[PDB]
Write a protein that binds this ligand. Structure first.
Ligand code: NAG
Ligand code: NI
Lengths: 104, 351, 215, 326, 46
């Protein structure tokens, strides 16, 4: 969907230690937003293990039931390499898959 | 940078934390915040989070068993209650909840009477277990020249109503009236056969006068408490039959401005050792001693009057009303009111 | 997905972390999750079993760090009760430290290094306070070659460049680079990597930050 | 720390481990680690002085680049001329940003070193003038360490008077109280009524008329063995007449006290001036401790002490018979 | 020969957390163009 968090103030200057500021949140409807403010000085000693949208899709992508970027050695191979099992009454069925993860 | 009168502030815990107490608190005219103390606990320690009373500063995040926490008030404020609380076995912190006081906060006649009875009556309910109830009340009145006949004679009438108030509970304890100055002066002793007679103790409280300690208008609180010590002491020989079953309630009015004798606290400790209190990890026996202090003199040192008063959980022993007139009203409301005295979930001695 | 408020904690503070329970379609779902917290020695010290049921797939949690705790790289492992084999993990470091007043960045002119490049390896030293302002001080930079999980420091490649106007400039001569290793042929360094170790110190001597650009 | 007992029961197998954590009295170190820093301050032939700083490294290799974090004493600034000499020197460098500061605000100096031999001591020095004059100056400090390791370092303090730049603090075992204050209360006629009120203050705990028996004075604190001739006001210390109490006072006040043995003194202090566990108490002569010379019997006949003895005399009686009013 | 502000009337800072604002918010405002907006009023640390 979408989620942006900008300043609610009319630009102006920089805030002062101990001042109120409007925090605008442009997110999706019916969505629960969890916040967390952290001093950048913390990322100076360690900036690893940071939750990023890039890492989220990274885990999802590295979990596809497919391995081959495309095509196979035969018709029954194209389906298995893509993530599908084609089986007809004529006798043409795809290869058996035992291992959860991809080969190699 | 500062909160004026009728100013409101709200509290809100983080995610995964429970908020107990009053979320919204308003600054009252008595220089105090309304409602209870706001505490954000996650419930991961053996004892609940002691929290940080408004104006104080807690030092110690660990709430395990045997662990402790220290408190410190801001500059210009007097810490009331305990400065150190230890998480005792059974999920409960020792001492009482701290509270930074200033020099004008005082206590409304209701706040005093309400916190006094809620701490006294409970110490009376347990007493009935079970003539002559197994409880002693030591009335130590200060007659120094630093108080004045005005705030003195008012303190007398204040005690008069107290005796009659206890009498309405159908209980006849052993009283001990003692007015001190440069030297203690015992009017009623707990060993007397008339100590249980509420009437006689009241008349003895009337015969006394502020002019009794005019020639030697000193302030030796130490000797005063020592006089109380001799009343609860024993030859030994005795070892008395039922010494470990008697509750002691010491009530004293004083401005806290002692100058002769030194630190009266030393005597309190001697009393604890005599009654064998806090000398047993399994049997504290803290329920066998209550020390109530009331500020009467114009200049009252809250620091000292607190060091003497006892520190029990959810109980107040330190009191400082606005004026003498209000101190009286505290005991007037008592005689009329009859709080419910029930003994539910109570245990007797202890085949 | 496990989210921790900070990446590093001090012995005594509390670790605020939340767990997100989503299906294979990345949608809120009520499930039962087993959560364990292993010490730097990989031994669970705390285990729970929450349920995101009626919680919109968000499990707020926290863990108190004892004063006397083992410093190192702690770990927060979690997995569904119905899938004990599929376990997710998120690490957080526990150490005694203090938040600096400024940051130190080290970015070479190129994201690599050409062997026959006589010019050498030029590295930029940008240092500014956490509030934007620039840093005035001195820097201590040193290079080194990183073999297969091995580091051979280069004592000869040590420089002291003044940091004026919140920036500096240091160059690693190709001469010193070859002098480091005891191998005459330069085509043997092909495949290895270099790492920079800078250190900025204010003129007041009140703060000192250490940065590094390896790989 | 108690002797507990563990009881296992049932089928299976586990492991029990018990470890106690505490603070051990190792010292021993005497740390300072791989550095031997010796700092000394000396006058000159405003005041201006010489600051010599010697250093050495504990190792088999001449330590690499080190740092000299120096902090001037309040009201002192390094001599610019001498700084230029050390800057142009070999194996020494001082940031240009530091040179151009004048006597404005150069209370902090950093001298970068290229190397420090592990054999002998690489000692340097530079003049330090006093641009601003003020009583009770703050001790300076010098710190040495490598550019890679900051934890392992050594810091020394320097002071014109105070030895090794340390501060006055009455230390006993592991309990020290700051003694950076005045000797006693005060010194313009102190009448009878003056003593009455000042002796009946809420703070005043003990009021004795003692006699200086023996003076055992040291380097950090001076013992003053006094003998209580009479207890005017019985404080929190249960002491009968004839017993001896040990008083303690900083060296700075030894000149102002000028206490002579076999002489009587009227002194009263606060209840917060005690030092030690009973019955081994030791009174402390703090900035709030009254001290007055008590003219002896035959001396109270001079036409100069009659005015004083009469006040003290009436004072004692008024304090014993009636005691503090109010 | 004196001015400035009394050293007694100077409220020194104290709140220097490494992390804060660990709360939860729900977007229930009238949705426009499928985008909900919430205006929070937080108090910056010292
Ligand atoms: C009370 O006194 C008797 C004296 O014989 C003693 O045996 C008993 O233990 C005491 N009770 C308590 C509460 O300890
Ligand atoms: Ni008095």
């Amino acid at each position: 969907g979408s989620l942006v968090v900008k300043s609610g103030q009319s630009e102006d200057r920089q805030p002062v230690p101990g001042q109120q500021m409007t925090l605008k949140i442009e997110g999706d409807h019916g969505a629960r937003v969890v916040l967390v403010a952290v001093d950048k000085g913390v990322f100076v000693l360690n900036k690893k293990n940071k939750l990023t949208q890039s890492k989220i899709w990274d885990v999802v992508e590295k979990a596809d039931i497919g391995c081959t970027p495309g095509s196979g050695k035969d018709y029954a191979g194209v389906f298995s390499d893509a993530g599908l099992t084609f089986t007809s009454s004529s006798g043409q069925q795809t290869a058996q898959r035992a291992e959860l993860q991809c080969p190699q | 940078p500062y909160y004026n009168v009728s100013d409101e502030i709200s509290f809100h815990c983080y995610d995964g934390y429970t908020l107990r107490g009053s979320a919204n608190r308003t600054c009252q005219v008595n220089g105090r915040w309304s409602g209870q103390t706001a505490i954000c606990d996650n419930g991961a320690g053996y004892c609940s989070n002691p929290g940080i009373p408004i104006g104080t500063r807690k030092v110690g995040s660990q709430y395990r068993l045997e662990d402790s926490v220290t408190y410190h008030c801001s500059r210009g404020l007097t810490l009331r209650g305990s400065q150190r609380r230890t998480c005792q076995e059974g999920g409960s912190w020792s001492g009482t909840e701290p509270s930074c006081q200033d020099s004008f906060m005082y206590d409304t006649p209701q706040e005093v009477a309400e916190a006094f009875l809620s701490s006294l009556t409970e110490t009376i309910e347990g007493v009935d277990a079970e003539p002559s109830g197994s409880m002693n009340i030591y009335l130590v009145l200060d007659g120094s020249g630093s108080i004045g006949a005005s705030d003195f004679t008012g303190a007398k009438k204040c005690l008069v109503n107290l005796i009659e108030k206890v009498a309405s509970y159908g209980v006849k304890p052993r009283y001990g009236l003692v007015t001190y100055a440069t030297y203690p002066k015992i009017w009623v002793k707990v060993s007397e056969a008339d100590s249980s007679n509420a009437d006689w103790v009241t008349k003895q409280l009337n015969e006394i006068n502020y002019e009794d300690h005019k020639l030697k208008s000193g302030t030796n609180t130490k000797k005063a408490l020592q006089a109380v010590y001799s009343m609860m002491s024993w030859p030994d020989d005795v070892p008395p039959e039922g010494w470990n079953r008697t509750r002691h309630v010491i009530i004293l009015m004083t401005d806290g401005l002692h100058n002769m004798g030194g630190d009266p606290i030393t005597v309190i400790d001697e009393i604890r050792d005599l009654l064998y209190i806090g000398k047993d990890r399994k049997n504290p026996r803290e329920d066998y001693l209550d020390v109530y202090v009331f500020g009467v003199g114009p200049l009252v040192n809250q620091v000292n009057i607190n060091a003497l008063a006892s520190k029990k959980d959810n109980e107040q022993h330190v009191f400082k009303v606005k004026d003498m007139e209000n101190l009286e009203d505290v005991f007037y409301q008592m005689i009329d009111e009859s709080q419910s005295l029930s003994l539910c979930g109570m245990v007797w001695e202890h085949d | 997905f496990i989210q921790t408020d900070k990446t590093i904690y001090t012995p005594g503070s509390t670790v605020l972390y939340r767990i997100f329970t989503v299906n294979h379609k990345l949608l809120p779902v009520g499930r039962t999750v087993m959560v364990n917290i292993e010490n730097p020695e990989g031994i669970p010290v705390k285990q729970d079993s929450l349920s995101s049921q009626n919680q919109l797939g968000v499990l707020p949690l926290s863990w108190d760090i004892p004063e006397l705790v083992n410093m190192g790289q702690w770990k927060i492992r979690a997995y569904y009760e119905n899938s004990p084999q599929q376990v997710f993990s998120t690490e957080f470091e526990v150490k005694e430290y203090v938040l600096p007043s400024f940051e130190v960045i080290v970015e070479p002119t190129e994201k690599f290094y050409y062997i026959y490049n006589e010019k050498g390896l030029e590295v930029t030293i940008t240092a500014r306070f956490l509030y934007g302002k620039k840093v005035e001080g001195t820097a201590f930079v040193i290079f080194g070659i990183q073999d297969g999980e091995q580091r051979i420091s280069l004592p000869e490649s040590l420089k002291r460049i003044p940091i004026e106007d919140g920036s500096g400039e240091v160059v690693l001569s190709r001469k010193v680079l070859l002098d480091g290793v005891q191998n005459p042929r330069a085509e043997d360094l092909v495949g290895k990597s270099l790492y920079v170790s800078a250190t900025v110190i204010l003129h007041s001597g009140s703060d000192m930050v250490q940065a590094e650009r390896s790989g | 720390n108690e002797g507990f007992t563990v009881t296992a029961e049932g089928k299976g197998q586990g492991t029990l481990s018990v470890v106690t954590m505490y603070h051990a009295k190792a010292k021993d170190q005497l740390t300072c680690n791989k550095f031997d820093l010796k700092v000394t301050i000396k006058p000159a032939p405003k005041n201006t002085m010489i600051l010599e700083i010697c250093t050495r490294y504990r190792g088999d290799q001449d330590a690499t680049m080190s740092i000299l974090d120096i902090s001037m004493m309040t009201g002192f600034a390094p001599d610019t001329d001498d700084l230029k000499q050390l800057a142009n020197g070999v194996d020494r460098y001082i940031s240009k940003y530091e040179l151009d500061k004048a006597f404005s605000d150069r209370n902090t100096l950093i001298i970068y070193l290229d190397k420090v031999s592990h054999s002998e001591d690489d000692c340097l020095a530079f003049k330090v003038h006093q641009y601003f004059n003020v009583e009770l100056i703050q001790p300076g400090a010098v710190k040495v360490y490598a550019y890679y390791n900051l934890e392992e370092s050594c810091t020394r303090f320097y002071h014109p008077e105070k030895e090794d730049g340390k501060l006055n603090k009455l230390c006993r075992d592991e309990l020290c109280r700051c003694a950076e204050e005045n000797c006693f209360i005060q010194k313009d006629k102190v009448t009878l009524e003056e003593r009455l009120d000042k002796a009946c203050e809420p703070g005043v705990d003990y009021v004795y008329k003692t006699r200086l028996v023996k003076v055992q004075l040291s380097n950090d604190f001076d013992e003053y063995i006094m003998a209580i001739e009479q207890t005017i006001k019985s404080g929190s210390d249960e002491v009968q007449v004839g017993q001896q109490r040990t008083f303690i006072s900083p060296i700075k006040c030894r000149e102002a006290l000028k206490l002579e043995e076999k002489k009587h003194y009227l002194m009263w202090g606060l209840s917060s001036d005690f030092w030690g566990e009973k019955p081994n108490l030791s009174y402390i002569i703090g900035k709030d401790t009254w001290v007055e010379h008590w003219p002896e019997e035959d001396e109270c006949q001079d036409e100069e002490n009659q005015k004083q003895c009469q006040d003290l005399g009436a004072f004692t009686e008024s304090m014993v018979v009636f005691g503090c009013p109010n | 020969d004196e001015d400035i502000i009394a050293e007694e009337n100077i409220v020194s800072r104290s709140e220097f957390p490494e992390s804060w604002l660990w709360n939860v918010e729900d977007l229930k405002e009238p949705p426009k163009n499928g985008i909900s907006t919430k205006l929070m009023n937080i108090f910056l640390k010292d």
